[PDB]
Write a protein that binds this ligand. Sequence first.
Ligand code: HEM
Length: 431
Amino acid sequence: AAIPDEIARQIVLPEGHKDNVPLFEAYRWLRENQPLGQARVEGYDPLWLITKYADLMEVERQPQIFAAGGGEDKGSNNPILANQAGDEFTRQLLGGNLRILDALPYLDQPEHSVVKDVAFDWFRPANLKKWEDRIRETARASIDRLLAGGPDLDAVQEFAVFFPLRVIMSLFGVPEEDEPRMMALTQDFFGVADPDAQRDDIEALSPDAAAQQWAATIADFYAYFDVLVESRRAEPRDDLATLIAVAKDENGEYFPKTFAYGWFVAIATAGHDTTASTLAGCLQSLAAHPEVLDRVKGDPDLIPDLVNESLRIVSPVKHFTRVALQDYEMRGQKIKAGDRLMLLFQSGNRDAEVFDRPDDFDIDRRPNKHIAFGYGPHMCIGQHLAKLELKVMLQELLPHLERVEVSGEPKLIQTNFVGGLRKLPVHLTFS
Ligand code: HEM
């Protein structure tokens, strides 16, 4: 049978993610009682909810069966779950399809492989070492401002958001004075269904509001990135903007500008927001588990383990969708050609078949098998930059912290997509 309606709504509807406790209890109910069922929520297409770690890997390693963008019918699947009214808005705007960005999540092989190869080498761990000193100087400047501002703050809006934004805009080539604009458009982009992040220029209460906000935000990013692409093509620099802006295909022709736009939107949004969420979630966990803060100050070589367990627990990228290109049997269920799937990375990260005491914050999981970056050819391109920035910041910050106390009510972004904390009121004790 269909998944029970209140479990299905908890995961599908963005409002279901406002509070992590009922959300994670819904993922757990499925993993334990209905690990592969179809959610049939009013206003949404039917979705197979992929809740089990093994099933996330099985789907993601088979892109010839489970497409992101619809395969040869390009744009026939939206990889980022919108409601039906929203997908209808987008088909009206684009003319029949949902490919509103040329960014990697919307692409299938072989197009996906050709475009990803433009930046694959730049993002490898050996090619990121040249940025470590600049990252460390940025972390140290951010920590100097934290110490100067005193012990009482919102660890998100008054600390964690700034470091990853400055890192990516510096590597990317965007000037420091444009950081506030990029931060505002990132809030619009990941806040399409959050009541406190509504744009002024869209009908907030329309059935397709989130889709209108998504489209409006992308148009603003395009306007900004068109100037940057033309600038770097005219005058190349040694920055990531140039690598993407000047990229040419196998025939020597630039990729269409929208392909650069797509990289730039992904880097300008996911490139800082997920890292900020993970850092704030790490601070929240160190408040709950002060013995962990003591241990990592005692042995700074535990910092990568702390980053891996923060990634597993926070898991800020909650899903992407796939479509079945053929019928496929999994876990005793018959997925039919055309059926959509929702990949629940946060649920995979709590799967008791893989993780002992999966809700416990345990930095001693070695290896830490988390799937917070996903899997398969679409696996996070930024993962190594994220792990480096979080390592460098924790190496510089934790010596300066004796204790983190949460002094006020935490707030999460209301989204089923790219979430995590927007507010974490703390009282810090500095060393
Ligand atoms: C804590 C940090 C982050 C987490 C947890 C995260 C997580 C994810 C996840 C789960 C996916 C989807 C993988 C899949 O479809 O199987 C993804 C995709 C992606 N992420 Fe990350 N991300 C992080 C940081 C970053 C950064 C720093 C960048 C860029 C600077 C980035 C760029 C991307 C891009 C471009 C994609 C699309 C890849 C594709 O579809 O081929 N991410 N990320």
